[PDB]
Structure 1
Amino acid sequence: ATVQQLEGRWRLVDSKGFDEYMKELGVGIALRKMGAMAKPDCIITCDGKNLTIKTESTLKTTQFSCTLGEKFEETTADGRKTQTVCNFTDGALVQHQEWDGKESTITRKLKDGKLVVECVMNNVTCTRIYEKVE
C-alpha cells in the first residue's frame, strides 16, 4: 500500500456518525445542516511528500496542503485552526489535529477499491465511504 494509491477524485456514497462527530466538535447548527446533506467529492493528490486534500461540493469547498510528517496550521471546514500532522503509516493516511487541548484523528484508507474515511474525537466516531469517480 502506498499514499499514491489514495490519489484521485472520490465521491461520497455513505456516511454514518458525521452529525454526532460534528456535535462533539461543537459545530453550530448552520454548519451541521450543511454537512448532513452535502455529498462532496474528495480530491487527493500527492507529489512525493506533498499532499493536498480538496473537498468539493456546491454547498462548501475546502482545501489544505502539507508536507507529510510536518506540523502545520490547518483551517478546518468549521473554522478551527488546528496544529495538524499527516503521515502515511501502516497502509493509511493518518491525520491528527490538535487545538485548544483537544485532539481528533482522521484516517483515509483504500478498502475493496473504496476510500474509507474515519474520524474520531473523544470516542465519538464517523465513517464515510467514497467511490472512485472520473
Structure 2
Amino acid sequence: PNFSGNWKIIRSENFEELLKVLGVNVMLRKIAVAAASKPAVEIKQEGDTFYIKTSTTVRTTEINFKVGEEFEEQTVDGRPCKSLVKWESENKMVCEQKLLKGEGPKTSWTLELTNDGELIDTMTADDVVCTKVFVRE
C-alpha cells in the first residue's frame, strides 16, 4: 500500500472533454492536452501523510496533506478549494472538495494503486469523470 515513486502517465481518458463541459476555452483545452503539458507525478507517502508534486514542462505544483485533515488546493479548472481525503480502502483514497468562494460543480478526485502497480487518478465534476493512469519510473 505504498504510493511513493516517480509516476509517468501512460493513459488519459476524457480530460479535454471534461474541461470542455466545464466551459474552459478551446485555447487552454488545447494547451492542457499538448504533449508538453503531460504531467509527471512524484509522490512521497509516509503512512497517512502525503507529498504530491505534479509537474509539466511549464508548470509545477505540490500538495502536502494528511488523510483526514483538511487542506487547501485548487479544482481542475483552478478554483481555490478546501479538500479532505479519506481512505476508501487500503489501496484507494478519495478527496471531497468544497469551493472556498462561490458555487460550482461538485468536484472530487481519487487515487488508487492496482496490484500490478499502476496508479489510477480519477477526477469528477458532477456527472463527468476523467481517468489518468501512471506507472512508476
TM-score scaled by length of structure 1: 0.84
Matched, 1:106 2:106: no
RMSD (Å) for aligned C-alpha atoms: 1.9
- CA offsets 1:95-131 (integer angstroms, 9 cap, x no match): 2211135421211111222111111111111110111
**Number of aligned positions between the proteins:** 130
For 1:62 and 1:23, the matched residues in 2 are separated by 23
Kindly state the Cα deviation for residue 39 of structure 1 after the two structures are TM-superposed.
1.4
For 2:127 and 2:76, the matched residues in 1 are separated by 20
TM-score scaled by length of structure 2: 0.82
Unaligned 5+ segments in structure 1 are none
Runs ≥4 residues deviating over 6 A: none
1:96 is aligned to 96
Distance change (3 Å), C-alpha of 1:72 and 1:24: farther
Secondary structure, in 3 states, of the residue corresponding to 2:59?
Answer: coil
Unaligned 5+ segments in structure 2 are none
For 1:70 and 1:24, the matched residues in 2 are separated by 31
Name the % identity: 32
Kindly state the Cα deviation for residue 57 of structure 1 after the two structures are TM-superposed.
1.4
Is the 1:24–1:121 contact (alpha carbons within 8 Å) kept by the matching residues of 2?
Answer: no
